[PDB]
């Protein structure tokens, strides 16, 4: 256990989800709602 | 991107000159910007001598 913990944090790669951008579909690119 | 040549603007919005700026606040400004980025065959003579 301990060494595989060590192994993955060393070559740190995580199976866990990331926060997807909330509306990926119609706004795939994602410029800010600001001045251009 | 809209600043003049010899000077830089601050986060306050004040264009200040690199020329008039001393090394102290130079290093401090560079430190704050780096922190923003962070948050984002030879010879035997050569051998024996």
């Amino acid at each position: 256990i301990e060494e595989l913990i060590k192994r993955r944090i060393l070559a740190g790669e995580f199976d866990e989800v990331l926060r997807r951008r909330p509306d990926m579909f119609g706004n795939p690119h994602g410029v800010r709602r600001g001045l251009v | 991107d809209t600043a003049e040549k010899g000077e830089v603007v601050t986060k306050a919005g004040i264009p200040i000159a690199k020329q008039e700026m001393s090394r102290e606040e130079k290093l401090r400004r560079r430190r704050r910007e780096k922190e923003r980025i962070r948050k984002a065959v030879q010879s035997s003579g050569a051998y024996k001598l």
Binding site: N27, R33, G34, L35 | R23, S44, K48
Partner: protein
């Protein structure tokens, strides 16, 4: 587990540090000790070796009006004031960051300026024992200091600067070299002229004179050029006569007299030396009509010359108690009472109990030196391929033989019985010489770097350029085995007194512990940060420690290890130059170590915050108004005697201070804090609002806080009596302030409107045609819906 200590240390006179001083005595600088010598006699009076420091000292200076107290400066930024009456340092001054280089005394001797490689110049008091203040200009490190009070300085951007003492800031600067750097500062002893010698051999000359207007004191009266286009190390004046000395580090120094700047300043003499001078120094001897120029030369020497004041001659020198160029071999005699030391050009044999040189011999180069048993003759091998044979008794050369042609003989080893010697050259052969005649040569593919015998005369081992080692038998030279496994060529090897063990150290920054039966690496050890040059066991296991061994390496360090537990039992520091040689006592009690030091060592709250801030401001206001009453009664001496924290914060106004403690924090906690402020604190606050109202600063802040304190305390305010006058006064002040500023910016905006209209009428249109279509900014405002 016996340990080793720095016991003896000698074999060297003044190193490559500058700024030597004369007193008929010559105080020169070693690495760690500041040591004083006689010049007529070869005997040094003493040395200043501080046990608490290890750093190499690199700045020495004699106090004016006070000899026998001297300020020195080390590599770590320390300034040790020592005594010559008693060989101890009275005070230490560690304020700099690194590498003290330039010093200047007071003419009285109470004030000390120090300038380092870390560019700071720190002034220190010598009766309060504090650094007085810190002086910060200097885009790069300093080169010259002088006490004019005032300070005249120069630094490595070719910058000369005059500062004031009473006002701790710079007063003037100028640039010496147009496209170079200054390197030497020389001040005339009467404060009338200064000379700055820079890189191109170019000495800019300037005149001197002894605040809102155009102050101009120093004048560039011109430039000059010397003969040698080198960076000038030092320009030193004559304290009494009209002469001075320019030297950059060469075999040429130049003395120039004082009578256009070329007409006034002409070279007196150009003196040629045997070596490259580190530092020149002056001397008046008591009772002579001469100029004693003391050169301290980088090749481990001192030389005192006579200059006649209206030529040069080698009057005195110190080169006897040390070698000259670079030590390259050692041989500590069988009795362990004397030793041999071999340097490039010079070989000297030295007695241990007096740690002093006894004899001296000359050659061209020297790789290896080793006496023969009986300690009557010494065998030396040199780069020109050659072997020379000297003796100790008659102090002469005996023989001279080209062993190999011009191949540097990397190895000289005596036969442990004492009848043959072996000599390994840079060629493809190596020769056994029985004493002397050539017994037998051996041929191989490449250059040998080290070979040894076995302590029982049974095996021999050669060790070659190919990062390989070939071990043979002693009788017939047939390959017992061969060792590999180093990526870089080996530098040294050492086998055990019982020949049960090998250590093989190479330029890969590691050592290999082998066994001498099957030659298996017992342990690879990666333990030095540099290329280890040498390693040595003790032959005497009579103490029970024979498998202990020392490994000496290029990064100035030796390590004491035990091969049995394969462990470094000690670290030996102490040297500051690349070690080349070392030798172990035959009893194993001490060791000697010779290095590129050219030396040898022998080893045995926010609301209450602004509230009490207001309170202190009230105290300061009371002091100021009483002081104004006093100075109105009479203009006599009446100090304000303000708060220590205020005069420390820089004599600032108390209202400015409380404005700062009001300006720092956020609007929310500001609102909160003023809500906290009790009604006892309200009149003090209101009076400060009156001060800001008259001295208008941060208008919306003052107005907002005023309104807030009204709305949290209004009924108390309309009920009170004494506040009515204060409110009337602050009201008058605020109406005045607001009306002034509003009329100001209204003037502004009206002028803006009219200048807009007229600029329009300027820019409107010139041509008239059928196209009025040509007659707008735009912005974007993206929206995710």
């Amino acid at each position: 587990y016996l340990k080793f200590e720095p016991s003896k240390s000698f074999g060297v006179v003044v190193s490559s540090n500058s700024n030597l001083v004369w007193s008929g005595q010559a105080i020169v600088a070693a690495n760690e000790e500041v040591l004083v010598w006689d010049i007529k006699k070869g005997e040094l009076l003493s040395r200043w070796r501080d046990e608490n420091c290890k750093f190499r000292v690199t700045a020495i200076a004699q106090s004016r009006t006070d000899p026998d107290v001297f300020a020195v400066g080390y590599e770590d930024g320390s300034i040790r004031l020592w005594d010559s009456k008693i060989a101890t340092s009275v005070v230490s001054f560690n304020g700099h960051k690194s590498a003290i280089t330039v010093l200047a005394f007071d003419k009285t001797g109470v004030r000390l300026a120090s300038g380092s490689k870390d560019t700071d110049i720190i002034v220190w008091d010598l009766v309060a024992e504090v650094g007085q203040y810190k002086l910060r200009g200097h885009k790069d490190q300093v080169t010259g200091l002088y006490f004019i009070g005032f300070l005249l300085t120069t630094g490595k951007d070719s910058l000369i600067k005059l500062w004031d003492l009473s006002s701790r800031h710079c007063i003037e600067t100028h640039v010496a070299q147009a496209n170079g750097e200054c390197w030497a500062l020389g001040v005339s002893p009467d404060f009338t002229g200064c000379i700055t010698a820079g890189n191109d051999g170019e000495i800019t000359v300037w005149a001197l004179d002894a605040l809102s207007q155009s102050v101009n004191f120093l004048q560039n009266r011109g430039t000059l050029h010397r003969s040698s286009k080198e960076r000038a190390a030092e320009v030193v004046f004559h304290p009494l006569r009209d002469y001075f000395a320019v030297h950059g580090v060469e075999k040429s120094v130049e003395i120039w007299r004082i009578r256009e700047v070329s007409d006034v300043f002409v070279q007196h003499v150009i003196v040629r030396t045997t070596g490259k001078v580190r530092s020149v120094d002056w001397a008046l001897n008591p009772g002579v009509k001469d100029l004693q120029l003391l050169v301290g030369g980088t090749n481990n020497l001192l030389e005192l010359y006579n200059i006649v004041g209206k030529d040069y001659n080698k009057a005195l020198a110190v080169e006897l108690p040390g070698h000259r160029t670079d030590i390259r071999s050692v041989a500590i005699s069988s009795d362990d009472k004397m030793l041999a030391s071999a340097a490039n050009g010079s070989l000297k044999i030295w007695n241990i109990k007096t740690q002093q040189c006894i004899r001296t011999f000359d050659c061209g180069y020297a790789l290896c030196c080793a006496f023969l048993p009986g300690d009557k003759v010494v065998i030396v091998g040199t780069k020109e391929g050659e072997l020379q044979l000297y003796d100790v008794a008659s102090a002469s050369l005996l023989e001279t033989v080209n062993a190999h042609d011009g191949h540097a003989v990397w190895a000289l080893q005596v036969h442990p019985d004492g009848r043959s010697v072996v000599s390994g050259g840079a060629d493809k052969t190596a020769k056994f010489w029985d004493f002397l005649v050539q017994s037998r040569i051996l041929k191989v593919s490449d250059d040998i770097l080290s070979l040894r015998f076995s302590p029982d005369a049974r095996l021999l081992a050669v060790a070659l350029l190919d990062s390989t080692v070939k071990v043979f038998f002693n009788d017939t030279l047939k390959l017992y085995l061969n060792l590999y496994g180093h990526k870089l060529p080996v530098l040294s090897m050492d086998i055990s007194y019982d020949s049960k063990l090998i250590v093989t150290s190479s330029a890969d920054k590691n050592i290999r512990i082998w066994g001498l039966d099957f030659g298996d690496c017992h342990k690879a050890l990666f333990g030095h940060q540099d290329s280890i040059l040498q390693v040595a066991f003790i032959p005497h296991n009579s103490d029970g420690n024979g498998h202990y061994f020392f490994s000496a390496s290029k990064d100035r360090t030796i390590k004491y290890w035990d091969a049995d537990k394969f462990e470094q039992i000690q670290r030996i520091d102490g040297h500051h130059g690349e070690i080349w040689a070392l030798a172990v006592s035959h009893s194993g009690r001490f060791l000697v170590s010779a290095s590129h030091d050219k030396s040898i060592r022998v080893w045995e709250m926010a609301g209450e915050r602004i509230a009490e801030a207001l309170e202190l401001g009230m105290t300061d206001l009371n002091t100021i108004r009483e002081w104004e009453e006093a100075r109105q009664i009479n203009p006599n001496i009446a100090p304000p005697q303000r708060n220590p924290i205020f005069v420390a914060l820089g004599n600032i106004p108390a209202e400015t201070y409380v404005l700062n403690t009001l300006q720092k924090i956020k609007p929310a906690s500001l609102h909160d804090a003023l809500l906290v402020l009790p009604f006892s604190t309200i009149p003090s606050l209101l009076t400060f609002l009156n001060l800001f109202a008259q001295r208008e600063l941060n208008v919306p802040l003052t107005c907002r806080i005023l309104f807030f304190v009204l709305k949290t305390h209004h009924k108390q305010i309309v009920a009170s009596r004494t506040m009515r006058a204060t409110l009337e006064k602050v009201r008058a002040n605020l109406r005045a302030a607001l009306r002034r500023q509003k009329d100001e910016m209204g003037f502004n905006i009206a002028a803006l409107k009219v200048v807009s209209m007229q600029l329009r009428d300027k820019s409107v249109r010139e041509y008239v045609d059928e196209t009025w279509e040509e007659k707008v900014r735009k912005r974007a405002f993206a929206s995710l819906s």
